[PDB]
Amino acid sequence: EVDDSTGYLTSDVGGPIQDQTSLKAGIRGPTLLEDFMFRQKIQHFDHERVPERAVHARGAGAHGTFTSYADWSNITAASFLNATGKQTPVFVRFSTVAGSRGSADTARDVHGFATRFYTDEGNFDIVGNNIPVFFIQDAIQFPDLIHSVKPRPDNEIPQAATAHDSAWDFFSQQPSTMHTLFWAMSGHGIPRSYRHMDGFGVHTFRFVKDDGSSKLIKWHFKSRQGKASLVWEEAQVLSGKNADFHRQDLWDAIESGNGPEWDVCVQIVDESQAQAFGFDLLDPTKIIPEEYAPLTKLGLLKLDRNPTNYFAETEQVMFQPGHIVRGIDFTEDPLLQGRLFSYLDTQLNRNGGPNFEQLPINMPRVPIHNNNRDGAGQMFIHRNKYPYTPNTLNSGYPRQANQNAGRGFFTAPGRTASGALVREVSPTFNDHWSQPRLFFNSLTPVEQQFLVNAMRFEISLVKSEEVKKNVLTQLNRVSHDVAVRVAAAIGLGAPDADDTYYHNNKTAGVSIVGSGPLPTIKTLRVGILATTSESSALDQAAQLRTRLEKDGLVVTVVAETLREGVDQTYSTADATGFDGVVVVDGAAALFASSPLFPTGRPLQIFVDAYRWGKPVGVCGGKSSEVLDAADVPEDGDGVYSEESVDMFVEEFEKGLATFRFTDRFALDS
Amino acid sequence: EVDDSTGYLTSDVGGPIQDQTSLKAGIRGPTLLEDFMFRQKIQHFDHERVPERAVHARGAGAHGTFTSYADWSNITAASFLNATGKQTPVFVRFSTVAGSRGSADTARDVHGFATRFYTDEGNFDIVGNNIPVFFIQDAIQFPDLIHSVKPRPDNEIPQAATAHDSAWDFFSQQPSTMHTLFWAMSGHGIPRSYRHMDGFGVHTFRFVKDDGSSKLIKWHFKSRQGKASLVWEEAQVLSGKNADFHRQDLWDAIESGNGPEWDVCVQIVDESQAQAFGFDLLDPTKIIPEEYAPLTKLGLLKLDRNPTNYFAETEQVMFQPGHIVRGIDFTEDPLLQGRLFSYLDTQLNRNGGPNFEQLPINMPRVPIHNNNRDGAGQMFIHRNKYPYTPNTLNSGYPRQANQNAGRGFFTAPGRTASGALVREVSPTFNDHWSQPRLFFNSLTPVEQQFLVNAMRFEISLVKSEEVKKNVLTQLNRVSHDVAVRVAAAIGLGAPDADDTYYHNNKTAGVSIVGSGPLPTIKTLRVGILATTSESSALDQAAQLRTRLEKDGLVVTVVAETLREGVDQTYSTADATGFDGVVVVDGAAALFATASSPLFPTGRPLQIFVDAYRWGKPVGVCGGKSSEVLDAADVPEDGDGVYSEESVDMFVEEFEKGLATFRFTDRFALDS
Amino acid sequence: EQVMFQPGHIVRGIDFTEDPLLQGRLFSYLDTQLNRNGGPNFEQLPINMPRVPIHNNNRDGAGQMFIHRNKYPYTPNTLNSGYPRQANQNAGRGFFTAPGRTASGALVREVSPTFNDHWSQPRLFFNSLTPVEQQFLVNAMRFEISLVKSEEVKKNVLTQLNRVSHDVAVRVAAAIGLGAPDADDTYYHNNKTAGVSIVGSGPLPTIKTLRVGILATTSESSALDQAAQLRTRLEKDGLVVTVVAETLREGVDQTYSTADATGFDGVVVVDGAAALFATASSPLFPTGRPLQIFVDAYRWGKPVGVCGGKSSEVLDAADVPEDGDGVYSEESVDMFVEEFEKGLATFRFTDRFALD
Numbered sequence A: 001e002v003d004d005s006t007g008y009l010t011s012d013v014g015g016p017i018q019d020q021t022s023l024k025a026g027i028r029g030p031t032l033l034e035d036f037m038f039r040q041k042i043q044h045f046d047h048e049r050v051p052e053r054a055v056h057a058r059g060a061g062a063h064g065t066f067t068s069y070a071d072w073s074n075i076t077a078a079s080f081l082n083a084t085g086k087q088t089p090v091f092v093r094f095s096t097v098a099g100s101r102g103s104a105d106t107a108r109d110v111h112g113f114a115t116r117f118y119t120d121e122g123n124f125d126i127v128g129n130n131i132p133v134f135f136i137q138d139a140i141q142f143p144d145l146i147h148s149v150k151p152r153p154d155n156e157i158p159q160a161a162t163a164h165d166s167a168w169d170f171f172s173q174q175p176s177t178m179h180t181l182f183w184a185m186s187g188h189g190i191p192r193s194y195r196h197m198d199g200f201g202v203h204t205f206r207f208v209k210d211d212g213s214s215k216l217i218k219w220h221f222k223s224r225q226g227k228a229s230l231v232w233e234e235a236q237v238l239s240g241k242n243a244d245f246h247r248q249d250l251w252d253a254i255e256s257g258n259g260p261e262w263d264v265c266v267q268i269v270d271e272s273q274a275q276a277f278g279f280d281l282l283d284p285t286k287i288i289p290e291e292y293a294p295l296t297k298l299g300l301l302k303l304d305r306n307p308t309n310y311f312a313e314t315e316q317v318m319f320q321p322g323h324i325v326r327g328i329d330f331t332e333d334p335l336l337q338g339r340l341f342s343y344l345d346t347q348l349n350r351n352g353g354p355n356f357e358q359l360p361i362n363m364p365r366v367p368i369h370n371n372n373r374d375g376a377g378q379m380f381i382h383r384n385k386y387p388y389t390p391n392t393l394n395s396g397y398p399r400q401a402n403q404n405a406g407r408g409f410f411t412a413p414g415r416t417a418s419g420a421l422v423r424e425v426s427p428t429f430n431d432h433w434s435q436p437r438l439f440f441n442s443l444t445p446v447e448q449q450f451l452v453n454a455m456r457f458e459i460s461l462v463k464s465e466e467v468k469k470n471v472l473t474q475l476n477r478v479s480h481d482v483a484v485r486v487a488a489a490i491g492l493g494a495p496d497a498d499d500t501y502y503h504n505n506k507t508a509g510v511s512i513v514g515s516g517p518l519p520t521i522k523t524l525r526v527g528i529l530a531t532t533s534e535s536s537a538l539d540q541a542a543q544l545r546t547r548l549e550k551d552g553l554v555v556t557v558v559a560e561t562l563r564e565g566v567d568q569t570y571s572t573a574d575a576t577g578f579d580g581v582v583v584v585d586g587a588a589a590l591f592a593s594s595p596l597f598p599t600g601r602p603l604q605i606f607v608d609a610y611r612w613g614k615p616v617g618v619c620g621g622k623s624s625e626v627l628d629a630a631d632v633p634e635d636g637d638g639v640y641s642e643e644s645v646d647m648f649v650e651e652f653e654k655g656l657a658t659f660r661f662t663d664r665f666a667l668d669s
Numbered sequence B: 001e002v003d004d005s006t007g008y009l010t011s012d013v014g015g016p017i018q019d020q021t022s023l024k025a026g027i028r029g030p031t032l033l034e035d036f037m038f039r040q041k042i043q044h045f046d047h048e049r050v051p052e053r054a055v056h057a058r059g060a061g062a063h064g065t066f067t068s069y070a071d072w073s074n075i076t077a078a079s080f081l082n083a084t085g086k087q088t089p090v091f092v093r094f095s096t097v098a099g100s101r102g103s104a105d106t107a108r109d110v111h112g113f114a115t116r117f118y119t120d121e122g123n124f125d126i127v128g129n130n131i132p133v134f135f136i137q138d139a140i141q142f143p144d145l146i147h148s149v150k151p152r153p154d155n156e157i158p159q160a161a162t163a164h165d166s167a168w169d170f171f172s173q174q175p176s177t178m179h180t181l182f183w184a185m186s187g188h189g190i191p192r193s194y195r196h197m198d199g200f201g202v203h204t205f206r207f208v209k210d211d212g213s214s215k216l217i218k219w220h221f222k223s224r225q226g227k228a229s230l231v232w233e234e235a236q237v238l239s240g241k242n243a244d245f246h247r248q249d250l251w252d253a254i255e256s257g258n259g260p261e262w263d264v265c266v267q268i269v270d271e272s273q274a275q276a277f278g279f280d281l282l283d284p285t286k287i288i289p290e291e292y293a294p295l296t297k298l299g300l301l302k303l304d305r306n307p308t309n310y311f312a313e314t315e316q317v318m319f320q321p322g323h324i325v326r327g328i329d330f331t332e333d334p335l336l337q338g339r340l341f342s343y344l345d346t347q348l349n350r351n352g353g354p355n356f357e358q359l360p361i362n363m364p365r366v367p368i369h370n371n372n373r374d375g376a377g378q379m380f381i382h383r384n385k386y387p388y389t390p391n392t393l394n395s396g397y398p399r400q401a402n403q404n405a406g407r408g409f410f411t412a413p414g415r416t417a418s419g420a421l422v423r424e425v426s427p428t429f430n431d432h433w434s435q436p437r438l439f440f441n442s443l444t445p446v447e448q449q450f451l452v453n454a455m456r457f458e459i460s461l462v463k464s465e466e467v468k469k470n471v472l473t474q475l476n477r478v479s480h481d482v483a484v485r486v487a488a489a490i491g492l493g494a495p496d497a498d499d500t501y502y503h504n505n506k507t508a509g510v511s512i513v514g515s516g517p518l519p520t521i522k523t524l525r526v527g528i529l530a531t532t533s534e535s536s537a538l539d540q541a542a543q544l545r546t547r548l549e550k551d552g553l554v555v556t557v558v559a560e561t562l563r564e565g566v567d568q569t570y571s572t573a574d575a576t577g578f579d580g581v582v583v584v585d586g587a588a589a590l591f592a593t594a595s596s597p598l599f600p601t602g603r604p605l606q607i608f609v610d611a612y613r614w615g616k617p618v619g620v621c622g623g624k625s626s627e628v629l630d631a632a633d634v635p636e637d638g639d640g641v642y643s644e645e646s647v648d649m650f651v652e653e654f655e656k657g658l659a660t661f662r663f664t665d666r667f668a669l670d671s
Numbered sequence C: 001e002q003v004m005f006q007p008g009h010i011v012r013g014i015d016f017t018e019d020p021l022l023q024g025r026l027f028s029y030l031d032t033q034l035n036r037n038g039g040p041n042f043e044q045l046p047i048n049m050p051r052v053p054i055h056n057n058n059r060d061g062a063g064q065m066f067i068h069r070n071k072y073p074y075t076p077n078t079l080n081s082g083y084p085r086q087a088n089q090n091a092g093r094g095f096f097t098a099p100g101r102t103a104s105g106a107l108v109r110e111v112s113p114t115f116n117d118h119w120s121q122p123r124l125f126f127n128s129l130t131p132v133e134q135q136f137l138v139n140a141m142r143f144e145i146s147l148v149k150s151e152e153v154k155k156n157v158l159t160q161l162n163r164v165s166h167d168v169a170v171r172v173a174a175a176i177g178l179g180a181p182d183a184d185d186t187y188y189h190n191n192k193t194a195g196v197s198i199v200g201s202g203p204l205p206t207i208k209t210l211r212v213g214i215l216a217t218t219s220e221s222s223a224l225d226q227a228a229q230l231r232t233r234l235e236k237d238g239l240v241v242t243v244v245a246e247t248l249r250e251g252v253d254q255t256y257s258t259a260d261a262t263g264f265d266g267v268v269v270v271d272g273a274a275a276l277f278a279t280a281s282s283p284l285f286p287t288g289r290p291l292q293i294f295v296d297a298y299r300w301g302k303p304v305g306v307c308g309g310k311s312s313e314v315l316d317a318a319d320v321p322e323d324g325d326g327v328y329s330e331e332s333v334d335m336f337v338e339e340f341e342k343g344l345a346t347f348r349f350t351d352r353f354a355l356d
């Protein structure tokens, strides 16, 4: 870390200098080439940018730690997992997928959840998503997926969105994508925060024990903050009002001592069970339903420290699935296999040089011993002048590490191969439709409506008639009902039911809206709509504040202008900034124009909050009546009307836990 | 151009190949290192991105042409300007300033307007903004301005916005910024499209004649589509609903044969007049008011062709003020001076190598003769095997070009220097406040309110009390009234009036809302809110369509679901998508506690009410039209509100509202 | 400088094998061009471009020189009618892996036992060289091993050499003053193979472009006339001729100052220059240079000769044996060339090199 809280400005080589005026040939003359102060400064500036990540360009990171719950030697040789209470430092970066680095956090997308464990046996990365399955079955297809999903190559439109022809052309032609597509079209596409989503490794990996035996595994990072998601119409506004929402949220949660947590869990099954669940475990488009393999809690992951310099830490972190440790191994998942190549190659693009692992954020916490040399930006000075193997002149050091010496990584010895070299897809990968259906069946009826609505939204933006038809064809193979309801919005006849893959199986744990109340409401945001006219209004506010802040909530008092007790103005305020909204009684005048905010804003905030399914309430005497003026039903679920401050809070806090009031949304017929 | 409409897939060296399945050791086996089809394709993918521009990362471009109105030999030796009707190909890129790639078009920012003329005497670049003055007086300060304005370096927040502590800390400590700050806080910060804004060179340059004499100049690109801007509350929504608004607009205008146009104009003054206007002309924080130097129309710029590949053309274009031609020269503007270094250096970052001028979009349209050799990505094979001067072995070729031979570029010979080498600011640069005031005085009273409101918005998001006070201090030096009104929103006492720079001077042409109606309404967007219940509703729509489309407008018919005659659904619709909004009579049911599973609650009315509140021409067309408005709470008699039965008379009335564009009577003023 | 080769640059008709060296190469040559070119579009350099059209979905990258018309660069698409099409064995003449190729067993980081004989083939190679060639090889090894500072390393080198040939180990060990270890005959044998010998591959099939230096002088007017006549003959047979003298002038290509034996395949002294080869010095070239060139040429095994009357005697002064193989003594210009040209074809006269 470099401290600049005191001292005189120096060049990068420590020579004291100024940087405020150019060296000129006369007070009104031209600038001089010999002005080294100018050029060193501007050169640095001109070269500040690096290429954004090819995918997941928009994201944010935090430091934390992982704690093991046990000695897991019975399932894996992995050292960071070899003792109860063992702590390993971590760094995590969350992201969206499609958008470039300045795009909104709250676009509809799949989300990245990438974790580095700086273990005492090397860095170990789990590079996953908030959705357990992926669009495609072979890495070689990744540029096709990503080209079709990103903006059109002629005009670069649209940013951060699947709502255009190419995306759906691809989805409709590459049916493997149905499963992920359904997830992304659910609320999983628009989480309330990084903290309210899970992480998944997606691929099956292997645990490997010192004796050489292997089990097949799936990583799950379960959120201890519960699952929550925005509603579309809300997300769209939020993208404009606050592109930085998710990163703001994570930053704040950590500043206030509410670091988010996850249980790091696995599903463990046998090599013999590769095809025992009615799909191939090498297929990254499938889940093992919890019904057939329960989760084992391995340890706790917690984030509790923000970075100091975003660029130096978050922007420069370079994850790789290739960062593997003794005790884990890969599987023959053709998607995973390709990823191994990509992540090592791409860092050359980003770093401009081969020494990227020497950046502080990428360095390990243990010594490095190898014969890698030179390259641009070489930061070490190697003492071993015989960097070859085998050597005698350095006494055969460094020594080869493997299964039986030096705790080397080793491939699971059980793994075997047979048959011809082929560029052909396994027939076992052919069912693209059942699991999407399983997924859809497992959502609450409102969740289903939302998903249909998300699909109606996007497909209606697809200009091409032929593509729309091909979309309906694919959707229909998952559910006729879905096809029918989606088709209705774009004015086409859904094709005739095809029941090859229809079924009524459900799975637990994939639903957001059906996952019951939040286990905590700490850090949720409450907006209090007040006024500077009635002296009573601000007193009501102040009292609500003390009560609510006591329960870990984040409170904002809104008024026409700022002053003691007021956090922000009606001008800068919006419903998307709050998880629940409270009008204090004394502000009724405002809800029934001003040069200090746009017309109708105070009521707009409240009405929006209500329509998006948020806990809304009026606190005070004439509360009975402020609602009929607002057109909000007094008896309605999650609408709160009370005089007793202590009782209002108590009631409201139950609404914040329910989080979304789903009775306010129309269903199909 | 590379065609891929037919054929089999090939590697980059032309070997026919496949790219859909990896090569595996057995059908359920691991992928093989020897799979070159895989690796070549993924390597390419892994290396697609290049660093975004250090500033102006978010932008869009188009191809067009420039036509000269005359032989301008009397003022400049510049060849692209030497004949009536002379045609030079151009490429233009517009942009914001602070946002990264992917940030919304409709953030509040200064805007870039960068023009390449591919002249028959070399490439000539005018790299300017939609605002005629800049924040700072010395290029060496650029990183300070930019650091403070971009996201905070600890958490990278907020994207594309000056609404945070550091920016205002900077503005308040660096008063030179007041002028540009006022412009950015006006509607100039949020133009309706790239087409509805002007371009300015900002700096004073020199025109130079073959005899060696020079005049001082200022470039102005005046928009033939007129000036128009969004209102804040609308821009915020738009940023979410359509980050791509400006680029979609420009793309569309060009596809439909409505290429935007600008008059390329200059102010021309004498070297003797450097300090004759009460400010130094080397100061990029000042304008020459039109009152003291009228504009001369030099020629016409028109954009009429979209690029084929965005990355290859728009992303790769690399502008440079250093791209100068015979007939123009620089001035000692310490901001311009530094720019010269930066734009050449930064392309190394962006291109990763020194041969960036060899990219098709950066190539000139004339031959190249010099001794530059090698470098990564060298695309030429040079025949001259004696690339030094002086040589005899290539008969002294290429020959030196200068004033008197080969039509060489040459520095204005009049230019002189004297005094000491100094890192000192000229005292003539010291008035940071008069011109901002001049600018403010020149805006309509509503425009002034909007500007106060923009400042109220931002300053209220500045967390630090001290910084807020210093902002008020600076604002006060421009106008006590402004300070008072702004201070009111953040609950502080404006400091006591300081009249050193107060005055009542006005200047013409800087006002948007006061620039009268638009000269054309072609390409403006009209949304027609209909329904699929009443068969009458869609028929009303269809008839409005034929009538409105005939006048060059872009028409969207909105209903619950899609079908013949319906362009989009209520679900995907929003007021920000339209310049005016029309409800057809037969849809009254939808605007009256009714809900649908096909769109969010209250959407149809929300669109209309939004349109009205943002100052747009709104109307109901049909019989019961009188009554649909009272339900909507929109005043029937109000300016730009339209109520008629006669389709022909409705259009005629509505089209007048579109030209007025914004109805300013709906916005509250201070007291 | 910019040409960038790749074994991955393969065509329909050829395929790789499971050679663990070849396999790795495939990765390395694609990766390294990123280093050299600084960017992913190296195949767009003129020298690396193919002569046929390119159809694929690769896009962007720094230094992108194309402007692609296909705005749907993904597969599968319908929006560009499923183009470009997949090419394979049965369509579009696609590359394809040999279908016979199969795999079996475990994933292993182990060396095949079939790779374990490191010594027979070197021996085969050595046995197939002429005895002088063998001496030269021993001598190269003597040269290098004696520059190896470490005693232990020298011993380990002898160990390995010995396993190929005890003779070789003994001869090499002689120069570095160590005892070769005891014969180990596991891989010894007397098999020979054809075509791996240079010195034993008989005369050259052509002598066109070989370089002949003619050592003359500007004192005797006769010397330059002899030269000029040798030139016309020799140049007629496609040789490249350099006439060397003290200074330049018409008919002289280079000076003794800039001249050296390494610059010539054979060397001829014209009779009229005898004075130069006999304690005589000049400020125009270093002491002894003219003779040094000749003596060097002879000692390196090159065809050397004197052309003229007093040719019999210039050699005894030079200490070059008149009767020696590839030494040429004649008065008749036509018969000198004819004899010399045979020496040029033999190229190296191996009888001048001592054996063990």
Ligand code: HDD
Pocket (backbone or CB within 6 Å): A053, A054, A055, A056, A059, A093, A094, A095, A111, A112, A113, A114, A127, A128, A129, A134, A138, A139, A140, A142, A201, A202, A203, A284, A317, A318, A319, A335, A336, A338, A339, A342, A343, A346, A347, B042, B046
């Ligand atoms: C072979 C191509 C390829 C394929 C099939 C995938 N990825 Fe990837 N991924 C990349 C190639 C890639 C990359 C282009 O190499 C990136 C971009 C920046 C980087 O360092 O790696 C990357 C970025 C990246 C990031 C951002 C890391 C960060 O925050 O810096 C995450 C979280 C993932 N990926 C996760 C996945 C998951 C869960 C996949 C499905 C199993 C997946 N990727 C398939």
Ligand code: HDD
Pocket (backbone or CB within 6 Å): A042, A046, B053, B054, B055, B056, B059, B093, B094, B095, B111, B112, B113, B114, B127, B128, B129, B134, B138, B139, B140, B142, B201, B202, B203, B284, B317, B318, B319, B335, B338, B339, B342, B343, B344, B346, B347
């Ligand atoms: C000393 C540094 C410096 C200063 C004082 C300025 N600029 Fe700049 N500008 C750059 C350094 C720079 C740059 C970093 O070199 C850029 C970024 C990307 C590029 O190629 O050049 C650039 C980009 C850039 C672009 C984008 C062109 C495109 O679309 O590719 C425009 C329109 C401008 N500038 C205009 C201006 C104006 C009107 C200025 C005030 C008079 C100005 N710049 C001051």
Ligand SMILES: *[C@@H]1O[C@H](CO)[C@@H](O[C@@H]2O[C@H](CO)[C@@H](O)[C@H](O)[C@H]2NC(C)=O)[C@H](O)[C@H]1NC(C)=O
Pocket (backbone or CB within 6 Å): A069, A070, A071, A072, A074, A075, A297
């Ligand atoms: C591997 O060892 C761990 C270490 O205790 C086992 O975890 C415990 O399992 C028993 C049930 O078998 C429970 O009563 C404990 O509460 C578990 N503790 C924890 C922290 O999980 C684990 O079961 C063993 N697994 C196998 C496959 O042998």
Ligand SMILES: *[C@@H]1O[C@H](CO)[C@@H](O[C@@H]2O[C@H](CO)[C@@H](O)[C@H](O)[C@H]2NC(C)=O)[C@H](O)[C@H]1NC(C)=O
Pocket (backbone or CB within 6 Å): A071, A073, A079, A080, A082, A083, A120, A121, A407
């Ligand atoms: C858990 O973690 C580390 C894995 O390296 C182990 O501690 C190491 O143990 C070996 C002894 O075999 C030492 O040579 C290393 O130097 C130790 N390293 C550190 C960092 O302490 C430990 O053995 C493992 N525990 C179990 C129960 O397997």
Ligand SMILES: *[C@@H]1O[C@H](CO)[C@@H](O[C@@H]2O[C@H](CO)[C@@H](O)[C@H](O)[C@H]2NC(C)=O)[C@H](O)[C@H]1NC(C)=O
Pocket (backbone or CB within 6 Å): A276, A277, A278, A434, A438, A503, A505
């Ligand atoms: C729906 O659920 C049933 C019940 O588990 C599944 O049928 C079983 O599948 C497993 C795995 O293939 C088999 O071992 C059993 O023989 C089946 N059991 C019974 C009781 O029928 C079925 O596979 C599921 N279908 C889908 C499409 O998910």
Ligand SMILES: *[C@@H]1O[C@H](CO)[C@@H](O[C@@H]2O[C@H](CO)[C@@H](O)[C@H](O)[C@H]2NC(C)=O)[C@H](O)[C@H]1NC(C)=O
Pocket (backbone or CB within 6 Å): B069, B070, B071, B072, B074, B075, B297
């Ligand atoms: C430079 O020459 C041009 C060439 O015509 C002059 O422009 C015209 O000026 C005349 C006479 O005042 C006007 O009637 C026209 O409006 C101009 N024509 C066009 C097409 O612009 C210009 O005035 C000359 N300027 C100077 C300083 O000599």
Ligand SMILES: *[C@@H]1O[C@H](CO)[C@@H](O[C@@H]2O[C@H](CO)[C@@H](O)[C@H](O)[C@H]2NC(C)=O)[C@H](O)[C@H]1NC(C)=O
Pocket (backbone or CB within 6 Å): B073, B079, B080, B082, B083, B120, B121
């Ligand atoms: C306008 O500019 C063009 C470009 O310089 C001039 O045409 C050139 O004239 C020179 C002679 O001075 C010729 O050698 C070139 O062949 C011409 N260039 C081209 C591209 O054709 C033209 O003469 C200029 N007109 C005036 C009035 O100066």
Ligand SMILES: *[C@@H]1O[C@H](CO)[C@@H](O)[C@H](O)[C@H]1NC(C)=O
Pocket (backbone or CB within 6 Å): B278, B434, B503, B505
């Ligand atoms: C204001 O305008 C008048 C007339 O243009 C001019 O004389 C005066 O100097 C101006 N003063 C300032 C401060 O702009």
Ligand SMILES: [Ca+2]
Pocket (backbone or CB within 6 Å): A352, B352, C038
């Ligand atoms: Ca580079």
